[PDB]
Ligand binder design. Structure first.
Ligand SMILES: O=C(NC/C=C/[C@H]1O[C@@H](n2cnc3cncnc32)[C@H](O)[C@@H]1O)c1cc([N+](=O)[O-])cc(O)c1O
Ligand SMILES: [Mg+2]
Length: 213
């Protein structure tokens, strides 16, 4: 049994099927109360929601599905006909994400790609009928944000106005990517300050009274 299976099972047992908000809330409860996990969480999630609603993207690419928290978050706000493509290297995580999406009733909007982003990005146009992307959500390994951004550019997947939205630019941090985009005339950058997910960390004191030998 893995933490990620435990999260999925908690969702199946407690959330309302076909209700994306309920699925988000079950994940957040479980991770707040039982086991920390690297989902973006509700605080940053609300910022995500505001951005997605502003731009109304027709085609979104996610790097790093994990358990599908952000895929549910994003897909539930997509208009009819819009698509989310989400890349996940770990087959266990890809399976969990697909089940999470199924449970939420969002499976028709989302396509899961099993593989490493560096290998899949060059296949997007031919295999998945993609011209350019409207939005990219980066939340995979932090050292991959910059190499994959350069690869997206190389592969012709970016157009004027494509929105990159990157998690964790403060903690754990993505310093090369952040410096790059902030210094490049090819990008206009805005920072949205928030809070790291699930940080009400329990600790305690132990009192141990010696009784003699
Ligand atoms: O490390 C974090 N995220 C990495 C996310 C990784 C997820 O993306 C997949 N992946 C990785 N490169 C990939 C390339 N291609 C496809 N999937 C890939 C991994 O298999 C995992 O499912 C993180 C850590 C903390 N934290 O506080 O420690 C907080 C956060 O919010 C985080 O996002
Ligand atoms: Mg993250």
């Amino acid at each position: 049994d893995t933490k990620e299976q435990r999260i999925l099972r908690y969702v199946q047992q407690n959330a309302k099927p076909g209700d994306p908000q309920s699925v988000l809330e079950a994940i957040d409860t479980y991770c707040t109360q039982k086991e920390w996990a690297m989902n973006v969480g509700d605080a940053k999630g609300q910022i995500m929601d505001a951005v997605i609603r502003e731009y109304s993207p027709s085609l979104v690419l996610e790097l790093g599905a994990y358990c599908g928290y952000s895929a549910v978050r994003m897909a539930r706000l997509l208009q009819p006909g819009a698509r989310l493509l989400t890349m996940e290297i770990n087959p266990d995580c890809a399976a969990i994400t697909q089940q999470m999406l199924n449970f939420a009733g969002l499976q028709d909007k989302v396509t899961i790609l099993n593989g490493a982003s560096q290998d899949l990005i060059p296949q997007l146009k031919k295999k998945y009928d993609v011209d350019t992307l409207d939005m990219v959500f980066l939340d995979h390994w932090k050292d991959r944000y910059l190499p994959d951004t350069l690869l997206l550019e190389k592969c012709g997947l970016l157009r004027k106005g494509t929105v990159l939205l990157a998690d964790n630019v403060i903690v754990p941090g993505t310093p090369d990517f952040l410096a790059y985009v902030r210094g490049s005339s090819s990008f206009e950058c805005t920072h949205y300050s928030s809070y790291l997910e699930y940080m009400k960390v329990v600790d305690g004191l132990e009192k141990a009274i010696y009784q003699g030998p």
